């Protein structure tokens, strides 16, 4: 087994997979274009891998190897030298001693911590994960970015309503041109905003909500999407992207309704045909006052629920996501916290 210990050491220290005899317990595909699938071979395992502890150990080793291979592919280096971190791993000599003692678990935890530290340092200093999360919160969550989406809505007021009232045969080329010119005028430094793409869905927001949840339902057929590249796609999956799309569509519906209400109020308060009265009207306090009270109630409902949401859900989640990456330890843990926050938002 001197060969197997060396193979395991290489896999746990560099992520290099060299199994020409199909003996190692893990091997990846591509020996979807950037994300390869890692298959675990249970016929050549070293333990049972049935209990929760053994399953977590195997998952930790596999995650260490995956992170090592991803760092190698990102740095374009054939191997990761030990000087890149303060953690050194010793090669396995006695397989029986390694199996009977906790030295295996110690080495696995050490290499996993080293890989996680290297990955976090790389994605924090070279990729600017803080800027990435700020940009995605500005795009999908509307965090400190309401001005841009409000300007977009005010510029494409007629286009959106005409597309929602017409069928799918209505040409959205004007809306696409507006979106692309806005993206071009946007600063090229914002990679998320420059890669933001727009599209039309055949189903509505309540339709997709009823398709995804256990609820019952041609308006609001617009949505946005981001194509997460490598090696950022191994962290930003597609489920969080779909959650972001749903939250963005909901916020867009809310903002469009508030914009319609604001436009109605501005018309009612600025039109002389509305603000004019006399000639023994006897209809002013009956019609104009009634509709103004109705609009005031609609405002005190919509704006109030929007404030409640954006304060006790959106703001709280933004604060938690901002305080979570303070001295991080696991990128997978950060992703799990983000998914849990999104799940809380959706299940509120």
């Amino acid at each position: 087994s001197q060969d197997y210990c060396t193979m395991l050491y290489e896999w746990l220290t560099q992520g290099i997979l060299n199994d020409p005899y199909q003996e190692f317990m893990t091997y990846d595909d591509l020996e979807r274009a950037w994300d390869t699938q890692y298959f675990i071979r249970k016929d050549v395992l070293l333990r049972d891998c049935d209990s929760e502890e053994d399953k977590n150990l195997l998952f930790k080793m596999l995650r260490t190897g995956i992170l090592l291979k991803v760092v190698r592919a990102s740095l374009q280096i054939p191997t990761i030298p030990s000087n890149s971190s303060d953690i050194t791993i010793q090669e396995i000599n006695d397989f029986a001693d390694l199996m009977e003692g906790s030295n295996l678990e110690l080495y696995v935890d050490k290499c996993y911590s080293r890989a996680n530290e290297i990955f976090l340092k790389l994605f924090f200093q070279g990729y600017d994960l803080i800027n990435v999360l700020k940009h995605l919160q500005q795009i999908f969550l509307g965090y400190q970015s309401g001005h841009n989406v409000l300007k977009f809505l005010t510029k494409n007021m007629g286009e959106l309503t005409k597309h929602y009232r017409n069928d799918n045969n209505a040409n959205y080329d004007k809306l696409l041109q507006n979106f692309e010119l806005e993206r071009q005028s946007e600063n090229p430094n914002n990679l998320m905003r420059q890669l933001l793409m727009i599209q039309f869905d055949t189903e509505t927001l309540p339709q997709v909500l009823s398709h995804y949840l256990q609820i019952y339902p041609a308006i609001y057929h617009l949505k946005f999407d981001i194509n997460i590249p490598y090696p950022l796609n191994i962290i930003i999956s597609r489920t969080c992207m779909i959650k972001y799309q749903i939250i963005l569509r909901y916020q867009l519906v809310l903002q469009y309704h508030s914009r319609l209400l604001d436009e109605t109020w501005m018309d009612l308060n600025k039109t002389p045909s509305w603000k004019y009265r006399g000639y023994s009207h006897t209809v002013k306090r009956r019609i104009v006052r009634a509709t103004r009270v109705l609009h005031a109630k609609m405002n005190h409902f919509i704006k109030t629920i929007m404030e409640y949401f954006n304060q006790n859900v959106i703001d709280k989640e933004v604060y938690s996501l901002e305080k979570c990456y303070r001295n991080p330890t696991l990128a997978v843990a950060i992703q799990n916290e983000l998914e849990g926050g999104l799940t809380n938002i959706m299940t509120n």
């Binding site: 489920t239 799940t343 809380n344």
Partner: peptide, 29 residues
């Protein structure tokens, strides 16, 4: 047990959404 059933409902919603999102769990030969 109220927080427990709330977390259970959240976990059920998460499982439903993960099963709807392409089913990342797979097995090969």
């Amino acid at each position: 047990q109220e927080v427990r059933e709330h977390q259970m409902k959240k976990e059920r919603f998460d499982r439903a959404l993960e099963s709807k999102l392409l089913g990342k769990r797979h097995i090969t030969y």
